[PDB]
Amino acid sequence: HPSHELLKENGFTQHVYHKYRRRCLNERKRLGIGQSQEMNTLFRFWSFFLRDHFNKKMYEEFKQLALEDAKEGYRYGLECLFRYYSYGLEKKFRLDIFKDFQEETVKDYEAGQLYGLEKFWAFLKYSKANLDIDPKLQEYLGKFRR
Amino acid sequence: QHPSHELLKENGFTQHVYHKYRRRCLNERKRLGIGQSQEMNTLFRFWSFFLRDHFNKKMYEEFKQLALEDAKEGYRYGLECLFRYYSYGLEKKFRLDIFKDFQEETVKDYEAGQLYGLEKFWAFLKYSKAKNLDIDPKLQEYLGKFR
Protein backbone atom coordinates (compact mmCIF):
# COMPACT_ATOMS: atom_id res chain seq x y z
CA HIS A 1 0.00 0.00 0.00
CA PRO A 2 1.33 3.39 -1.01
CA SER A 3 0.25 4.54 2.47
CA HIS A 4 3.13 2.47 3.80
CA GLU A 5 5.79 2.53 1.13
CA LEU A 6 5.79 6.27 1.51
CA LEU A 7 6.46 6.25 5.25
CA LYS A 8 9.53 3.99 5.04
CA GLU A 9 12.85 5.74 5.58
CA ASN A 10 13.59 7.81 2.51
CA GLY A 11 10.78 5.92 0.72
CA PHE A 12 8.83 9.05 -0.15
CA THR A 13 8.65 10.04 -3.80
CA GLN A 14 6.63 13.08 -4.92
CA HIS A 15 5.41 10.90 -7.81
CA VAL A 16 3.89 7.99 -5.89
CA TYR A 17 2.38 10.52 -3.48
CA HIS A 18 0.71 12.66 -6.18
CA LYS A 19 -0.92 9.58 -7.70
CA TYR A 20 -1.98 8.33 -4.27
CA ARG A 21 -3.36 11.70 -3.07
CA ARG A 22 -5.19 12.26 -6.36
CA ARG A 23 -6.75 8.80 -6.02
CA CYS A 24 -7.90 9.31 -2.40
CA LEU A 25 -9.45 12.72 -3.02
CA ASN A 26 -11.33 11.23 -5.98
CA GLU A 27 -12.87 8.40 -3.97
CA ARG A 28 -13.91 10.93 -1.31
CA LYS A 29 -15.68 12.95 -4.03
CA ARG A 30 -17.13 9.87 -5.71
CA LEU A 31 -18.28 8.12 -2.52
CA GLY A 32 -18.97 11.07 -0.19
CA ILE A 33 -17.37 12.54 2.95
CA GLY A 34 -16.56 9.76 5.44
CA GLN A 35 -17.44 7.00 2.95
CA SER A 36 -14.00 6.32 1.51
CA GLN A 37 -11.70 4.06 3.53
CA GLU A 38 -8.94 5.07 1.14
CA MET A 39 -9.31 8.70 2.15
CA ASN A 40 -8.94 7.50 5.74
CA THR A 41 -5.55 6.00 4.81
CA LEU A 42 -4.44 9.42 3.59
CA PHE A 43 -5.48 11.07 6.83
CA ARG A 44 -3.41 8.49 8.69
CA PHE A 45 -0.50 8.93 6.27
CA TRP A 46 -0.45 12.69 6.81
CA SER A 47 -0.68 12.35 10.58
CA PHE A 48 2.49 10.23 10.69
CA PHE A 49 4.52 11.66 7.78
CA LEU A 50 4.29 15.29 8.89
CA ARG A 51 5.85 14.54 12.30
CA ASP A 52 9.31 13.87 10.78
CA HIS A 53 8.89 15.45 7.35
CA PHE A 54 6.91 18.64 7.90
CA ASN A 55 5.50 20.07 4.67
CA LYS A 56 3.47 23.27 5.17
CA LYS A 57 1.45 22.58 2.02
CA MET A 58 0.51 19.01 3.00
CA TYR A 59 -0.25 20.19 6.55
CA GLU A 60 -2.59 22.95 5.37
CA GLU A 61 -4.55 20.51 3.19
CA PHE A 62 -4.59 17.93 6.01
CA LYS A 63 -6.16 20.46 8.38
CA GLN A 64 -8.61 21.89 5.84
CA LEU A 65 -9.95 18.46 4.87
CA ALA A 66 -10.06 17.12 8.44
CA LEU A 67 -12.20 20.11 9.43
CA GLU A 68 -14.55 19.77 6.45
CA ASP A 69 -15.20 16.12 7.34
CA ALA A 70 -15.64 17.03 11.01
CA LYS A 71 -18.27 19.65 10.12
CA GLU A 72 -20.38 16.84 8.64
CA GLY A 73 -19.81 14.61 11.68
CA TYR A 74 -17.00 12.36 10.44
CA ARG A 75 -14.26 12.61 13.04
CA TYR A 76 -11.41 10.43 11.82
CA GLY A 77 -9.53 13.16 9.95
CA LEU A 78 -9.70 15.51 12.90
CA GLU A 79 -8.79 12.68 15.29
CA CYS A 80 -5.73 12.07 13.10
CA LEU A 81 -4.86 15.78 13.18
CA PHE A 82 -5.04 15.97 16.98
CA ARG A 83 -2.74 12.92 17.16
CA TYR A 84 -0.33 14.71 14.81
CA TYR A 85 -0.38 17.76 17.09
CA SER A 86 0.01 15.82 20.36
CA TYR A 87 2.65 13.25 19.27
CA GLY A 88 4.54 15.44 16.77
CA LEU A 89 4.96 18.49 18.99
CA GLU A 90 6.29 16.15 21.67
CA LYS A 91 9.16 14.90 19.48
CA LYS A 92 9.83 18.15 17.66
CA PHE A 93 8.23 21.14 19.37
CA ARG A 94 7.56 24.14 17.18
CA LEU A 95 5.66 27.29 18.08
CA ASP A 96 3.33 27.90 15.11
CA ILE A 97 1.88 24.37 15.11
CA PHE A 98 1.48 24.59 18.90
CA LYS A 99 -0.54 27.77 18.33
CA ASP A 100 -2.69 25.87 15.82
CA PHE A 101 -3.06 22.98 18.31
CA GLN A 102 -4.49 25.45 20.83
CA GLU A 103 -6.85 27.03 18.32
CA GLU A 104 -8.27 23.72 17.07
CA THR A 105 -8.60 22.43 20.64
CA VAL A 106 -10.66 25.50 21.61
CA LYS A 107 -12.83 25.05 18.52
CA ASP A 108 -13.32 21.32 19.24
CA TYR A 109 -14.26 22.17 22.83
CA GLU A 110 -16.74 24.92 21.93
CA ALA A 111 -18.37 22.47 19.49
CA GLY A 112 -19.09 20.16 22.44
CA GLN A 113 -16.35 17.56 21.86
CA LEU A 114 -13.57 16.54 24.26
CA TYR A 115 -11.25 14.49 22.01
CA GLY A 116 -9.07 17.53 21.30
CA LEU A 117 -8.96 18.68 24.93
CA GLU A 118 -7.82 15.26 26.18
CA LYS A 119 -5.09 15.21 23.51
CA PHE A 120 -3.93 18.66 24.62
CA TRP A 121 -3.88 17.66 28.29
CA ALA A 122 -1.95 14.50 27.40
CA PHE A 123 0.57 16.61 25.49
CA LEU A 124 1.21 18.81 28.56
CA LYS A 125 1.67 15.76 30.77
CA TYR A 126 4.24 14.22 28.48
CA SER A 127 5.76 17.51 27.48
CA LYS A 128 9.27 18.09 28.51
CA ALA A 129 8.95 21.74 27.62
CA ASN A 130 8.15 27.76 28.73
CA LEU A 131 4.60 27.20 27.38
CA ASP A 132 2.13 30.00 27.14
CA ILE A 133 -1.39 28.58 27.08
CA ASP A 134 -4.48 30.43 25.82
CA PRO A 135 -6.43 31.69 28.90
CA LYS A 136 -9.63 30.11 27.55
CA LEU A 137 -7.85 26.78 27.20
CA GLN A 138 -6.47 26.76 30.75
CA GLU A 139 -10.02 27.54 31.81
CA TYR A 140 -11.43 24.57 29.88
CA LEU A 141 -8.70 22.26 31.18
CA GLY A 142 -9.54 23.23 34.77
CA LYS A 143 -13.23 22.38 34.40
CA PHE A 144 -12.46 19.09 32.68
CA ARG A 145 -10.47 17.81 35.66
CA ARG A 146 -13.06 19.23 38.09
CA GLN B 1 -15.70 18.04 46.14
CA HIS B 2 -17.43 17.18 42.86
CA PRO B 3 -19.48 14.06 43.30
CA SER B 4 -17.57 12.29 40.52
CA HIS B 5 -14.47 12.18 42.70
CA GLU B 6 -16.11 11.04 45.86
CA LEU B 7 -18.05 8.29 44.20
CA LEU B 8 -14.88 6.76 42.75
CA LYS B 9 -12.95 6.50 46.02
CA GLU B 10 -12.47 3.07 47.53
CA ASN B 11 -15.74 2.63 49.48
CA GLY B 12 -16.86 6.05 48.38
CA PHE B 13 -20.01 5.06 46.61
CA THR B 14 -23.46 5.45 48.12
CA GLN B 15 -26.85 5.14 46.37
CA HIS B 16 -28.08 8.45 47.78
CA VAL B 17 -25.08 10.52 46.61
CA TYR B 18 -25.15 8.80 43.22
CA HIS B 19 -28.90 9.36 42.78
CA LYS B 20 -28.58 13.10 43.38
CA TYR B 21 -25.53 13.41 41.08
CA ARG B 22 -27.23 11.40 38.30
CA ARG B 23 -30.41 13.39 38.65
CA ARG B 24 -28.50 16.61 38.43
CA CYS B 25 -26.61 15.62 35.32
CA LEU B 26 -29.69 14.40 33.53
CA ASN B 27 -31.49 17.60 34.56
CA GLU B 28 -28.74 19.72 32.99
CA ARG B 29 -28.89 17.62 29.81
CA LYS B 30 -32.66 18.14 29.65
CA ARG B 31 -32.23 21.90 30.23
CA LEU B 32 -29.30 22.59 27.88
CA GLY B 33 -29.97 19.91 25.26
CA ILE B 34 -28.11 16.81 24.06
CA GLY B 35 -24.32 17.35 24.19
CA GLN B 36 -24.55 20.86 25.66
CA SER B 37 -23.95 19.68 29.24
CA GLN B 38 -20.48 19.50 30.77
CA GLU B 39 -21.97 17.88 33.89
CA MET B 40 -23.29 15.04 31.70
CA ASN B 41 -19.76 14.64 30.33
CA THR B 42 -18.41 14.08 33.83
CA LEU B 43 -21.10 11.43 34.33
CA PHE B 44 -20.07 9.58 31.12
CA ARG B 45 -16.45 9.59 32.38
CA PHE B 46 -17.56 8.39 35.82
CA TRP B 47 -19.50 5.48 34.32
CA SER B 48 -16.58 4.57 32.08
CA PHE B 49 -14.25 4.25 35.08
CA PHE B 50 -16.62 2.99 37.81
CA LEU B 51 -18.18 0.14 35.82
CA ARG B 52 -14.81 -1.51 35.22
CA ASP B 53 -14.50 -2.83 38.80
CA HIS B 54 -18.05 -2.17 40.04
CA PHE B 55 -20.21 -3.41 37.18
CA ASN B 56 -23.90 -2.64 37.53
CA LYS B 57 -26.24 -3.81 34.75
CA LYS B 58 -28.81 -1.04 35.07
CA MET B 59 -26.12 1.66 35.20
CA TYR B 60 -24.31 0.16 32.20
CA GLU B 61 -27.51 0.06 30.16
CA GLU B 62 -28.27 3.73 30.85
CA PHE B 63 -24.64 4.67 30.04
CA LYS B 64 -24.93 2.89 26.70
CA GLN B 65 -28.37 4.36 25.89
CA LEU B 66 -27.36 7.96 26.56
CA ALA B 67 -23.99 7.60 24.78
CA LEU B 68 -25.77 6.37 21.65
CA GLU B 69 -28.46 9.10 21.87
CA ASP B 70 -25.76 11.75 22.04
CA ALA B 71 -23.71 10.24 19.22
CA LYS B 72 -26.72 10.37 16.96
CA GLU B 73 -26.74 14.11 17.34
CA GLY B 74 -23.03 14.25 16.61
CA TYR B 75 -21.70 14.60 20.16
CA ARG B 76 -19.28 11.77 20.58
CA TYR B 77 -17.84 12.00 24.10
CA GLY B 78 -20.31 9.56 25.69
CA LEU B 79 -19.65 6.93 23.06
CA GLU B 80 -15.90 7.45 23.22
CA CYS B 81 -16.14 6.82 26.97
CA LEU B 82 -18.20 3.71 26.24
CA PHE B 83 -15.61 2.35 23.81
CA ARG B 84 -12.86 2.96 26.37
CA TYR B 85 -14.94 1.15 29.01
CA TYR B 86 -15.24 -1.76 26.55
CA SER B 87 -11.60 -1.80 25.42
CA TYR B 88 -9.90 -1.38 28.78
CA GLY B 89 -12.55 -2.98 31.00
CA LEU B 90 -12.85 -6.26 29.06
CA GLU B 91 -9.07 -6.70 29.01
CA LYS B 92 -9.04 -6.43 32.80
CA LYS B 93 -12.16 -8.51 33.41
CA PHE B 94 -13.68 -10.27 30.41
CA ARG B 95 -17.48 -10.57 30.34
CA LEU B 96 -18.93 -12.46 27.39
CA ASP B 97 -22.22 -10.52 27.26
CA ILE B 98 -20.46 -7.14 27.31
CA PHE B 99 -18.01 -8.42 24.65
CA LYS B 100 -20.96 -9.14 22.37
CA ASP B 101 -22.22 -5.55 22.95
CA PHE B 102 -18.68 -4.26 22.17
CA GLN B 103 -18.81 -6.11 18.84
CA GLU B 104 -22.24 -4.74 18.04
CA GLU B 105 -21.37 -1.11 18.84
CA THR B 106 -18.09 -1.32 16.95
CA VAL B 107 -19.81 -2.60 13.79
CA LYS B 108 -22.38 0.21 14.08
CA ASP B 109 -19.69 2.87 14.61
CA TYR B 110 -17.75 1.66 11.56
CA GLU B 111 -20.84 1.53 9.35
CA ALA B 112 -21.64 5.09 10.49
CA GLY B 113 -18.26 6.12 9.05
CA GLN B 114 -16.12 6.36 12.20
CA LEU B 115 -12.94 4.51 13.20
CA TYR B 116 -12.78 5.30 16.93
CA GLY B 117 -14.66 2.13 17.88
CA LEU B 118 -12.77 -0.08 15.44
CA GLU B 119 -9.40 1.11 16.78
CA LYS B 120 -10.52 0.42 20.34
CA PHE B 121 -11.71 -3.08 19.34
CA TRP B 122 -8.37 -3.61 17.63
CA ALA B 123 -6.54 -2.50 20.75
CA PHE B 124 -8.60 -4.90 22.89
CA LEU B 125 -7.71 -7.85 20.61
CA LYS B 126 -4.04 -6.87 20.75
CA TYR B 127 -3.97 -6.91 24.56
CA SER B 128 -6.64 -9.45 25.58
CA LYS B 129 -5.64 -12.90 26.84
CA ALA B 130 -9.16 -14.26 26.28
CA LYS B 131 -9.20 -17.46 24.21
CA ASN B 132 -11.75 -18.80 21.70
CA LEU B 133 -13.17 -15.38 20.83
CA ASP B 134 -16.02 -15.67 18.34
CA ILE B 135 -15.83 -12.39 16.48
CA ASP B 136 -18.69 -11.19 14.20
CA PRO B 137 -17.87 -12.12 10.56
CA LYS B 138 -18.40 -8.57 9.20
CA LEU B 139 -16.35 -7.07 12.00
CA GLN B 140 -13.50 -9.41 10.99
CA GLU B 141 -13.74 -8.03 7.46
CA TYR B 142 -13.56 -4.46 8.81
CA LEU B 143 -10.62 -5.27 11.08
CA GLY B 144 -8.84 -6.78 8.07
CA LYS B 145 -8.93 -3.61 5.98
CA PHE B 146 -8.03 -1.50 8.99
CA ARG B 147 -4.73 -3.05 10.13
CSV table of C-alpha atoms in Angstrom, one decimal:
chain,number,residue,atom,x,y,z
A,1,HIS,CA,0.0,0.0,0.0
A,2,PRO,CA,1.3,3.4,-1.0
A,3,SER,CA,0.2,4.5,2.5
A,4,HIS,CA,3.1,2.5,3.8
A,5,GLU,CA,5.8,2.5,1.1
A,6,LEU,CA,5.8,6.3,1.5
A,7,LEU,CA,6.5,6.2,5.2
A,8,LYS,CA,9.5,4.0,5.0
A,9,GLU,CA,12.9,5.7,5.6
A,10,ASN,CA,13.6,7.8,2.5
A,11,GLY,CA,10.8,5.9,0.7
A,12,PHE,CA,8.8,9.1,-0.1
A,13,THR,CA,8.6,10.0,-3.8
A,14,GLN,CA,6.6,13.1,-4.9
A,15,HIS,CA,5.4,10.9,-7.8
A,16,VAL,CA,3.9,8.0,-5.9
A,17,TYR,CA,2.4,10.5,-3.5
A,18,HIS,CA,0.7,12.7,-6.2
A,19,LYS,CA,-0.9,9.6,-7.7
A,20,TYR,CA,-2.0,8.3,-4.3
A,21,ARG,CA,-3.4,11.7,-3.1
A,22,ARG,CA,-5.2,12.3,-6.4
A,23,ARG,CA,-6.7,8.8,-6.0
A,24,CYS,CA,-7.9,9.3,-2.4
A,25,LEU,CA,-9.5,12.7,-3.0
A,26,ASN,CA,-11.3,11.2,-6.0
A,27,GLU,CA,-12.9,8.4,-4.0
A,28,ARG,CA,-13.9,10.9,-1.3
A,29,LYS,CA,-15.7,13.0,-4.0
A,30,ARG,CA,-17.1,9.9,-5.7
A,31,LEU,CA,-18.3,8.1,-2.5
A,32,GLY,CA,-19.0,11.1,-0.2
A,33,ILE,CA,-17.4,12.5,3.0
A,34,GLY,CA,-16.6,9.8,5.4
A,35,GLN,CA,-17.4,7.0,3.0
A,36,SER,CA,-14.0,6.3,1.5
A,37,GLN,CA,-11.7,4.1,3.5
A,38,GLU,CA,-8.9,5.1,1.1
A,39,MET,CA,-9.3,8.7,2.1
A,40,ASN,CA,-8.9,7.5,5.7
A,41,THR,CA,-5.6,6.0,4.8
A,42,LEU,CA,-4.4,9.4,3.6
A,43,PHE,CA,-5.5,11.1,6.8
A,44,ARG,CA,-3.4,8.5,8.7
A,45,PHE,CA,-0.5,8.9,6.3
A,46,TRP,CA,-0.4,12.7,6.8
A,47,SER,CA,-0.7,12.3,10.6
A,48,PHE,CA,2.5,10.2,10.7
A,49,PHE,CA,4.5,11.7,7.8
A,50,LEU,CA,4.3,15.3,8.9
A,51,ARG,CA,5.9,14.5,12.3
A,52,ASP,CA,9.3,13.9,10.8
A,53,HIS,CA,8.9,15.5,7.4
A,54,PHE,CA,6.9,18.6,7.9
A,55,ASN,CA,5.5,20.1,4.7
A,56,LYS,CA,3.5,23.3,5.2
A,57,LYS,CA,1.5,22.6,2.0
A,58,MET,CA,0.5,19.0,3.0
A,59,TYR,CA,-0.2,20.2,6.6
A,60,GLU,CA,-2.6,23.0,5.4
A,61,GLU,CA,-4.5,20.5,3.2
A,62,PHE,CA,-4.6,17.9,6.0
A,63,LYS,CA,-6.2,20.5,8.4
A,64,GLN,CA,-8.6,21.9,5.8
A,65,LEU,CA,-10.0,18.5,4.9
A,66,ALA,CA,-10.1,17.1,8.4
A,67,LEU,CA,-12.2,20.1,9.4
A,68,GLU,CA,-14.6,19.8,6.4
A,69,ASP,CA,-15.2,16.1,7.3
A,70,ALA,CA,-15.6,17.0,11.0
A,71,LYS,CA,-18.3,19.6,10.1
A,72,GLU,CA,-20.4,16.8,8.6
A,73,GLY,CA,-19.8,14.6,11.7
A,74,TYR,CA,-17.0,12.4,10.4
A,75,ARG,CA,-14.3,12.6,13.0
A,76,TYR,CA,-11.4,10.4,11.8
A,77,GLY,CA,-9.5,13.2,10.0
A,78,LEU,CA,-9.7,15.5,12.9
A,79,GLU,CA,-8.8,12.7,15.3
A,80,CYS,CA,-5.7,12.1,13.1
A,81,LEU,CA,-4.9,15.8,13.2
A,82,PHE,CA,-5.0,16.0,17.0
A,83,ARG,CA,-2.7,12.9,17.2
A,84,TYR,CA,-0.3,14.7,14.8
A,85,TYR,CA,-0.4,17.8,17.1
A,86,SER,CA,0.0,15.8,20.4
A,87,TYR,CA,2.6,13.3,19.3
A,88,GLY,CA,4.5,15.4,16.8
A,89,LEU,CA,5.0,18.5,19.0
A,90,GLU,CA,6.3,16.1,21.7
A,91,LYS,CA,9.2,14.9,19.5
A,92,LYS,CA,9.8,18.2,17.7
A,93,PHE,CA,8.2,21.1,19.4
A,94,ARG,CA,7.6,24.1,17.2
A,95,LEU,CA,5.7,27.3,18.1
A,96,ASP,CA,3.3,27.9,15.1
A,97,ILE,CA,1.9,24.4,15.1
A,98,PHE,CA,1.5,24.6,18.9
A,99,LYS,CA,-0.5,27.8,18.3
A,100,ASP,CA,-2.7,25.9,15.8
A,101,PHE,CA,-3.1,23.0,18.3
A,102,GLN,CA,-4.5,25.4,20.8
A,103,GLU,CA,-6.9,27.0,18.3
A,104,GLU,CA,-8.3,23.7,17.1
A,105,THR,CA,-8.6,22.4,20.6
A,106,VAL,CA,-10.7,25.5,21.6
A,107,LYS,CA,-12.8,25.0,18.5
A,108,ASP,CA,-13.3,21.3,19.2
A,109,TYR,CA,-14.3,22.2,22.8
A,110,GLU,CA,-16.7,24.9,21.9
A,111,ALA,CA,-18.4,22.5,19.5
A,112,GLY,CA,-19.1,20.2,22.4
A,113,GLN,CA,-16.4,17.6,21.9
A,114,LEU,CA,-13.6,16.5,24.3
A,115,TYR,CA,-11.2,14.5,22.0
A,116,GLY,CA,-9.1,17.5,21.3
A,117,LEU,CA,-9.0,18.7,24.9
A,118,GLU,CA,-7.8,15.3,26.2
A,119,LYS,CA,-5.1,15.2,23.5
A,120,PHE,CA,-3.9,18.7,24.6
A,121,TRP,CA,-3.9,17.7,28.3
A,122,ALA,CA,-2.0,14.5,27.4
A,123,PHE,CA,0.6,16.6,25.5
A,124,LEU,CA,1.2,18.8,28.6
A,125,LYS,CA,1.7,15.8,30.8
A,126,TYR,CA,4.2,14.2,28.5
A,127,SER,CA,5.8,17.5,27.5
A,128,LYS,CA,9.3,18.1,28.5
A,129,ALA,CA,9.0,21.7,27.6
A,130,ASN,CA,8.2,27.8,28.7
A,131,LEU,CA,4.6,27.2,27.4
A,132,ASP,CA,2.1,30.0,27.1
A,133,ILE,CA,-1.4,28.6,27.1
A,134,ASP,CA,-4.5,30.4,25.8
A,135,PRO,CA,-6.4,31.7,28.9
A,136,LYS,CA,-9.6,30.1,27.5
A,137,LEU,CA,-7.9,26.8,27.2
A,138,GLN,CA,-6.5,26.8,30.8
A,139,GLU,CA,-10.0,27.5,31.8
A,140,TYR,CA,-11.4,24.6,29.9
A,141,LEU,CA,-8.7,22.3,31.2
A,142,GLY,CA,-9.5,23.2,34.8
A,143,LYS,CA,-13.2,22.4,34.4
A,144,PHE,CA,-12.5,19.1,32.7
A,145,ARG,CA,-10.5,17.8,35.7
A,146,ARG,CA,-13.1,19.2,38.1
B,1,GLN,CA,-15.7,18.0,46.1
B,2,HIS,CA,-17.4,17.2,42.9
B,3,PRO,CA,-19.5,14.1,43.3
B,4,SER,CA,-17.6,12.3,40.5
B,5,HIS,CA,-14.5,12.2,42.7
B,6,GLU,CA,-16.1,11.0,45.9
B,7,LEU,CA,-18.0,8.3,44.2
B,8,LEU,CA,-14.9,6.8,42.7
B,9,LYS,CA,-13.0,6.5,46.0
B,10,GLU,CA,-12.5,3.1,47.5
B,11,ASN,CA,-15.7,2.6,49.5
B,12,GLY,CA,-16.9,6.0,48.4
B,13,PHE,CA,-20.0,5.1,46.6
B,14,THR,CA,-23.5,5.4,48.1
B,15,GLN,CA,-26.8,5.1,46.4
B,16,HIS,CA,-28.1,8.5,47.8
B,17,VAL,CA,-25.1,10.5,46.6
B,18,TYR,CA,-25.2,8.8,43.2
B,19,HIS,CA,-28.9,9.4,42.8
B,20,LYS,CA,-28.6,13.1,43.4
B,21,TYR,CA,-25.5,13.4,41.1
B,22,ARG,CA,-27.2,11.4,38.3
B,23,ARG,CA,-30.4,13.4,38.7
B,24,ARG,CA,-28.5,16.6,38.4
B,25,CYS,CA,-26.6,15.6,35.3
B,26,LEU,CA,-29.7,14.4,33.5
B,27,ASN,CA,-31.5,17.6,34.6
B,28,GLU,CA,-28.7,19.7,33.0
B,29,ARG,CA,-28.9,17.6,29.8
B,30,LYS,CA,-32.7,18.1,29.7
B,31,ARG,CA,-32.2,21.9,30.2
B,32,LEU,CA,-29.3,22.6,27.9
B,33,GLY,CA,-30.0,19.9,25.3
B,34,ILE,CA,-28.1,16.8,24.1
B,35,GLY,CA,-24.3,17.4,24.2
B,36,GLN,CA,-24.5,20.9,25.7
B,37,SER,CA,-23.9,19.7,29.2
B,38,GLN,CA,-20.5,19.5,30.8
B,39,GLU,CA,-22.0,17.9,33.9
B,40,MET,CA,-23.3,15.0,31.7
B,41,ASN,CA,-19.8,14.6,30.3
B,42,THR,CA,-18.4,14.1,33.8
B,43,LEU,CA,-21.1,11.4,34.3
B,44,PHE,CA,-20.1,9.6,31.1
B,45,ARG,CA,-16.4,9.6,32.4
B,46,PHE,CA,-17.6,8.4,35.8
B,47,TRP,CA,-19.5,5.5,34.3
B,48,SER,CA,-16.6,4.6,32.1
B,49,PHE,CA,-14.3,4.2,35.1
B,50,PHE,CA,-16.6,3.0,37.8
B,51,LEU,CA,-18.2,0.1,35.8
B,52,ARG,CA,-14.8,-1.5,35.2
B,53,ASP,CA,-14.5,-2.8,38.8
B,54,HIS,CA,-18.0,-2.2,40.0
B,55,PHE,CA,-20.2,-3.4,37.2
B,56,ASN,CA,-23.9,-2.6,37.5
B,57,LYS,CA,-26.2,-3.8,34.7
B,58,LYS,CA,-28.8,-1.0,35.1
B,59,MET,CA,-26.1,1.7,35.2
B,60,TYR,CA,-24.3,0.2,32.2
B,61,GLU,CA,-27.5,0.1,30.2
B,62,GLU,CA,-28.3,3.7,30.9
B,63,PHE,CA,-24.6,4.7,30.0
B,64,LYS,CA,-24.9,2.9,26.7
B,65,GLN,CA,-28.4,4.4,25.9
B,66,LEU,CA,-27.4,8.0,26.6
B,67,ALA,CA,-24.0,7.6,24.8
B,68,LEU,CA,-25.8,6.4,21.6
B,69,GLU,CA,-28.5,9.1,21.9
B,70,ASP,CA,-25.8,11.8,22.0
B,71,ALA,CA,-23.7,10.2,19.2
B,72,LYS,CA,-26.7,10.4,17.0
B,73,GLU,CA,-26.7,14.1,17.3
B,74,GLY,CA,-23.0,14.3,16.6
B,75,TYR,CA,-21.7,14.6,20.2
B,76,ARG,CA,-19.3,11.8,20.6
B,77,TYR,CA,-17.8,12.0,24.1
B,78,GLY,CA,-20.3,9.6,25.7
B,79,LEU,CA,-19.6,6.9,23.1
B,80,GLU,CA,-15.9,7.5,23.2
B,81,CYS,CA,-16.1,6.8,27.0
B,82,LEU,CA,-18.2,3.7,26.2
B,83,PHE,CA,-15.6,2.4,23.8
B,84,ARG,CA,-12.9,3.0,26.4
B,85,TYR,CA,-14.9,1.2,29.0
B,86,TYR,CA,-15.2,-1.8,26.6
B,87,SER,CA,-11.6,-1.8,25.4
B,88,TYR,CA,-9.9,-1.4,28.8
B,89,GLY,CA,-12.6,-3.0,31.0
B,90,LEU,CA,-12.8,-6.3,29.1
B,91,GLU,CA,-9.1,-6.7,29.0
B,92,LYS,CA,-9.0,-6.4,32.8
B,93,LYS,CA,-12.2,-8.5,33.4
B,94,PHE,CA,-13.7,-10.3,30.4
B,95,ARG,CA,-17.5,-10.6,30.3
B,96,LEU,CA,-18.9,-12.5,27.4
B,97,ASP,CA,-22.2,-10.5,27.3
B,98,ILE,CA,-20.5,-7.1,27.3
B,99,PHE,CA,-18.0,-8.4,24.7
B,100,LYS,CA,-21.0,-9.1,22.4
B,101,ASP,CA,-22.2,-5.6,23.0
B,102,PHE,CA,-18.7,-4.3,22.2
B,103,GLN,CA,-18.8,-6.1,18.8
B,104,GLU,CA,-22.2,-4.7,18.0
B,105,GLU,CA,-21.4,-1.1,18.8
B,106,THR,CA,-18.1,-1.3,16.9
B,107,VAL,CA,-19.8,-2.6,13.8
B,108,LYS,CA,-22.4,0.2,14.1
B,109,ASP,CA,-19.7,2.9,14.6
B,110,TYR,CA,-17.7,1.7,11.6
B,111,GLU,CA,-20.8,1.5,9.4
B,112,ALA,CA,-21.6,5.1,10.5
B,113,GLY,CA,-18.3,6.1,9.1
B,114,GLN,CA,-16.1,6.4,12.2
B,115,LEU,CA,-12.9,4.5,13.2
B,116,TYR,CA,-12.8,5.3,16.9
B,117,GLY,CA,-14.7,2.1,17.9
B,118,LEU,CA,-12.8,-0.1,15.4
B,119,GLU,CA,-9.4,1.1,16.8
B,120,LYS,CA,-10.5,0.4,20.3
B,121,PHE,CA,-11.7,-3.1,19.3
B,122,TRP,CA,-8.4,-3.6,17.6
B,123,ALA,CA,-6.5,-2.5,20.8
B,124,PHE,CA,-8.6,-4.9,22.9
B,125,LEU,CA,-7.7,-7.8,20.6
B,126,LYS,CA,-4.0,-6.9,20.7
B,127,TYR,CA,-4.0,-6.9,24.6
B,128,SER,CA,-6.6,-9.4,25.6
B,129,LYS,CA,-5.6,-12.9,26.8
B,130,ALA,CA,-9.2,-14.3,26.3
B,131,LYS,CA,-9.2,-17.5,24.2
B,132,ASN,CA,-11.8,-18.8,21.7
B,133,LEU,CA,-13.2,-15.4,20.8
B,134,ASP,CA,-16.0,-15.7,18.3
B,135,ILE,CA,-15.8,-12.4,16.5
B,136,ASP,CA,-18.7,-11.2,14.2
B,137,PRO,CA,-17.9,-12.1,10.6
B,138,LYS,CA,-18.4,-8.6,9.2
B,139,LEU,CA,-16.3,-7.1,12.0
B,140,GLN,CA,-13.5,-9.4,11.0
B,141,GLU,CA,-13.7,-8.0,7.5
B,142,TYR,CA,-13.6,-4.5,8.8
B,143,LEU,CA,-10.6,-5.3,11.1
B,144,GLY,CA,-8.8,-6.8,8.1
B,145,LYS,CA,-8.9,-3.6,6.0
B,146,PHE,CA,-8.0,-1.5,9.0
B,147,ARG,CA,-4.7,-3.0,10.1
